[PDB]
């Protein structure tokens, strides 16, 4: 019966809560209180990449840390050479409402999608030198919110239909489908080894998925509202989530529990994007007040602020070598900080 | 300096030239509209009327006085809209179509409109309100089988506005009911409007051919008021 099953679910939730309470022998804050802070972090706008006509919704760094793909809701993908500010490509999208973009680790392809429910793959190295739509992955019944390449052939996408999916670009079919989220999945983050990935969704829940087995291994809760952003710790054993309740939180996969919370009483706007520095000591988060707070990931102290965006900060990424931070915004400008 | 650097700069210049070409046509000379409505609404008929001028989003392109309008209708999306509706924070106007003849869902339509109006990211977007299904509303009012005041008790006290211009053949009851619905929407419109955006009600039907001209005129008025406010003339 339904009542018996829900009572069993309540009992199991109590079991899990008690089990993870037994593991809370200490807190990261009181373990890190003895180490000196990083200090007052300062970053200046080295480059300001302009050329987009409308709000930028997403950006991604190439593995070389030079090239940079950004998606704007004017219907354009632009590949930037961040060193020289020169444009490398300008791909006209078939749908204006792009909500995400990705750069292949090899750099041969870029992907993007949005309200059209389709992930389009663009071949950047066509023999004729013109970008062509290599594939158009369809099957999701809701807007695409995130997408990340595992390699030149596989891509993982999260959609507003509450499901994530693993695709084979060559065949264009959904190799695996990930279900369990109750609301829209808003962000996605592959682990460094790409054996695992975490997805943040509405319902204030984050889940850990194993791509080969295709099932949810752990569910992380603690946020009070929608989770808009998620990023893996460089170690790969933890991740940080930004939420609409104006709070970031750090979770450890093995502890199966929230470690630290990054919030201040004077901050009440939601968080749109989060990222870690190369060492993982700094947690950079974008906010709806078009600022970015640099958080001491171990101390939960605001190490600094990145200001200069006129409108909402929507995307935020750190290079693979950790040399610079790129932040996009609804004012249509990208800025490289260092 | 080098040949490769010069080639890269030249390619960037060509890209910038194409971007300059794009920034005028289909970027700045065209106006984007978001079309909203419920299942019972007739927004499909609105799209069909505007046309003469397996998932995702639907776009309709039409022209009035050589001005280019792109009207977007969401297709295969879930029932939760607090996330994907942020994408339309810069459209010139929102077309909101309502089934005025369905009393049972008028409150649902009103809550939809109120949420749209009071959203933080739609805080500057004017709403063009189409009170669709006027003929059905007239038939329902004339029949008298459905007691409209049972859904909205205030209707038992509401009196038709003095400036309410009726149709030549409109029954007084039809005028009272339609204007009561319009004022129910306008109360929400005005109770929270800081002058940054406005609501433009229209009575429409499935056979009506003036909807494109209505949208053109309302977008003109919206942008005119925006410019007047910008220059401290309003």
């Amino acid at each position, epitope marked *: 019966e339904l009542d018996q099953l829900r009572q069993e679910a309540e009992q199991l939730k109590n079991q899990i809560r008690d089990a993870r309470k037994a593991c809370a022998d200490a807190t990261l804050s009181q373990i890190t209180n003895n180490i000196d802070p990083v200090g007052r972090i300062q970053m200046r706008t080295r480059r300001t990449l302009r050329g987009h006509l409308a709000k930028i919704y997403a950006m991604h760094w190439g593995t070389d840390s030079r090239l940079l793909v950004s998606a704007s809701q004017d219907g354009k993908l632009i590949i930037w050479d961040s060193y020289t500010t020169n444009k490398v490509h300008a791909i006209p999208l078939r749908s204006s409402w792009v909500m995400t973009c990705a750069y292949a680790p090899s750099g041969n392809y870029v992907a993007c999608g949005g309200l059209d429910n389709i992930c389009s793959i663009y071949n950047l190295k066509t023999r004729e030198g013109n970008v062509r739509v290599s594939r158009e992955l369809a099957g999701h019944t809701g807007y695409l919110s995130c997408c990340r390449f595992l390699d030149d052939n596989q891509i993982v996408t999260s959609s507003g239909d509450t499901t994530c999916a693993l695709w084979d670009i060559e065949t264009g079919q959904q190799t695996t489908t990930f279900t369990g989220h109750t609301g829209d999945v808003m962000s996605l983050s592959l682990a460094p080894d790409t054996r695992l990935f975490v997805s943040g969704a509405c319902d*204030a829940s984050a889940k850990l998925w194993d791509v080969r087995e295709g099932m949810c291994r752990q569910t992380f809760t603690g946020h009070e509202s*929608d989770i808009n952003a998620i990023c893996f710790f460089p170690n790969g054993n933890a991740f940080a989530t930004g939420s609409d*309740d104006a709070t970031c939180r750090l979770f450890d996969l093995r502890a199966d529990q929230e470690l630290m919370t990054y919030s201040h009483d004077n901050i009440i706007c939601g968080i749109t994007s989060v990222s870690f520095s190369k060492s993982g000591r700094l947690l950079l988060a974008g906010y709806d007040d078009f600022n970015c707070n640099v958080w001491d990931a171990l101390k939960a102290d605001r190490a600094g602020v990145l200001a200069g965006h006129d409108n909402r900060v929507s995307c935020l990424g750190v290079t693979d070598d950790g040399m610079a931070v790129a932040t996009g915004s609804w004012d249509s400008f990208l800025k490289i900080w260092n | 300096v080098s040949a490769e650097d010069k080639a890269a700069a030249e390619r960037s210049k060509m890209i910038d030239k194409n971007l300059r070409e794009d920034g005028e046509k289909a970027a700045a000379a065209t106006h984007r509209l978001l079309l909203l409505g419920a299942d019972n609404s007739g927004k499909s008929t609105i799209v069909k009327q505007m046309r003469i001028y397996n998932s995702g989003i639907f776009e309709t392109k039409f022209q009035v006085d050589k001005v280019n309008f792109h009207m977007f209708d969401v297709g295969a999306q879930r029932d939760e*809209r*607090r996330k994907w509706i942020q994408c339309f924070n810069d459209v010139t106007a929102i077309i909101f179509v309502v089934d005025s003849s369905d009393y049972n869902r008028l*409150q649902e339509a009103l*809550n939809d409109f109120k949420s749209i109006w009071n959203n933080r990211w739609l805080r500057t977007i004017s709403v063009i309100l189409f009170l669709n299904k006027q003929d059905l509303l007239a038939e329902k009012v004339l029949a008298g089988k459905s007691k409209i005041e*049972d859904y909205f008790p*205030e209707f038992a006290r509401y009196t038709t506005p003095e400036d309410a211009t009726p149709e030549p053949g409109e029954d007084p009851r039809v005028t009272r009911a339609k204007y009561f619905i319009r004022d129910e929407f306008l109360r929400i419109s005005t109770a929270s409007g800081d002058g940054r955006h406005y609501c433009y009600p229209h009575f429409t039907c499935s056979v009506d051919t003036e909807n494109a001209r209505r949208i053109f005129n309302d977008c003109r008025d919206i942008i005119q008021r925006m410019h007047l406010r910008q220059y401290e003339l309003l």
Partner: nanobody
Amino acid sequence: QVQLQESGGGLVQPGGSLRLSCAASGFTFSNYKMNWVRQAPGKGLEWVSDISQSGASISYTGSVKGRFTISRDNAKNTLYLQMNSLKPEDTAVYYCARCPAPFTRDCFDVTSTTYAYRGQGTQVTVS
């Protein structure tokens, strides 16, 4: 973990009274609007009432004005719906819906089919 637990309900004669209560936990109860929604048999979810963060501004659906009155107790993190003059058409499952985001004035998806921040629901029947 955000969870909302309604209480109260059961059979009642027409013209009777009920006091529906919701105990909320896992979030700052005072930062959000709170709503009451109901789903009569064979019908979709219907928004019944609403109340602001501090209780200053409240609203009701037309068929409910004058009969129900919504109340909020931020100290106790409890939401109430005093239901007077009940009628047979009030027979429905009553859910308490949390506003999706704090400090916001809009409540977009409270009445959706699978809204995440809704309660489990309590059944109310009027003879």
